[PDB]
Amino acid sequence: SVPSQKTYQGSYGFRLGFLHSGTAKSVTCTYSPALNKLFCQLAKTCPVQLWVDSTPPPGTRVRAMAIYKQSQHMTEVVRRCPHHERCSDSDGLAPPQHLIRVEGNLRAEYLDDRNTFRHSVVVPCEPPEVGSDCTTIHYNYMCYSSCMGGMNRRPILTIITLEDSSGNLLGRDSFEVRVCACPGRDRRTEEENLR
Ligand SMILES: CN(C)CCn1cc(-c2ccc(F)cc2)c(-n2cccc2)n1
Ligand SMILES: [Zn+2]
């Protein structure tokens, strides 16, 4: 009833990477290594790098899923709030209920799990562009952490899994996410609080 969040590099040495975007007031997406936490604005591009030591087989896929970080909420499906699920902002592929979208990939598939009811979005693994050392996926988060009747100020984690063609686990990584109006300020504040 709860997806594992255990970091697992697996046989291919799978792990995530994030850009270094800084904490200026104007920043739209920024990652804190000290907090393992991504801060982003609503519906803005979040670049996430996929790193491997060796190339996985054809048919390998990468899935993203959100869960609540606090144990007492972890069995609750993370979904868009009653306002955002009804705002008709679909890209024609993502169901309006899904928090996490993949941007600019027509091969993205959205799953409503028939047993757990959890949402996820999965894309085929593709080779890096010539000249690049990793592949990047662009995610969007479609509700604020503060949305009432949705996340309602509760922190979430995104779990990224590398899967074979049957959906079996090959690798796993994860990060906390806060979707907020001013990611730069919030990252600075939370990093100061930690210190
Ligand atoms: C070590 N270097 C060479 C890795 C380059 N790379 C190939 C794939 C790759 C290429 C084709 C395919 F079918 C599956 C993975 C991939 N990758 C990993 C996650 C998502 C893409 N990275
Ligand atoms: Zn919302």
Side-chain angles (χ1 to χ4, degrees):
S1 63
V2 184
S4 172
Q5 61 181 90
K6 175 73 173 298
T7 299
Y8 173 58
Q9 289 210 348
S11 305
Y12 304 102
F14 177 71
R15 72 281 187 180
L16 304 175
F18 298 87
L19 303 178
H20 303 271
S21 303
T23 59
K25 186 179 182 314
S26 62
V27 82
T28 62
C29 179
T30 187
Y31 175 73
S32 173
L35 299 163
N36 186 31
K37 186 167 178 170
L38 185 70
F39 297 78
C40 61
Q41 287 176 349
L42 177 69
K44 303 286 186 175
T45 305
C46 299
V48 177
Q49 302 176 328
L50 310 177
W51 290 92
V52 290
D53 292 326
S54 57
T55 303
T60 302
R61 302 204 293 176
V62 177
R63 184 179 305 276
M65 180 185 289
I67 63 167
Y68 287 111
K69 182 185 183 193
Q70 299 162 285
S71 53
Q72 69 269 29
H73 298 297
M74 219 182 334
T75 65
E76 181 176 334
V77 172
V78 178
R79 58 171 61 260
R80 294 180 87 192
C81 75
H83 166 67
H84 282 117
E85 76 168 5
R86 298 183 65 242
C87 75
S88 302
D89 58 4
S90 87
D91 52 14
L93 191 52
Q97 303 95 322
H98 283 219
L99 177 69
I100 305 178
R101 298 184 184 174
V102 167
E103 194 172 7
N105 189 334
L106 295 178
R107 303 174 71 195
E109 297 180 3
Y110 291 84
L111 177 65
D112 291 334
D113 195 288
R114 293 176 182 179
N115 295 129
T116 70
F117 306 111
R118 291 184 192 272
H119 306 161
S120 61
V121 56
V122 59
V123 298
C125 295
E126 294 159 351
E129 305 298 309
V130 168
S132 289
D133 294 316
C134 69
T135 292
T136 300
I137 299 180
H138 299 102
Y139 291 109
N140 298 157
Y141 291 83
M142 304 301 303
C143 260
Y144 288 111
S145 292
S146 65
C147 279
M148 296 304 291
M151 290 181 282
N152 188 24
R153 304 184 301 273
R154 299 174 285 180
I156 60 159
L157 307 173
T158 298
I159 302 167
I160 307 295
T161 48
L162 188 70
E163 297 179 345
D164 69 18
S165 61
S166 289
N168 303 308
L169 176 73
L170 300 176
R172 189 187 298 107
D173 202 345
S174 65
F175 53 99
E176 183 174 347
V177 180
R178 175 179 172 76
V179 189
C180 55
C182 194
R185 183 190 63 200
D186 290 352
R187 176 175 167 198
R188 274 172 7 238
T189 300
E190 297 190 21
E191 285 188 0
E192 175 59 10
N193 292 352
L194 170 66
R195 171 214 80 80

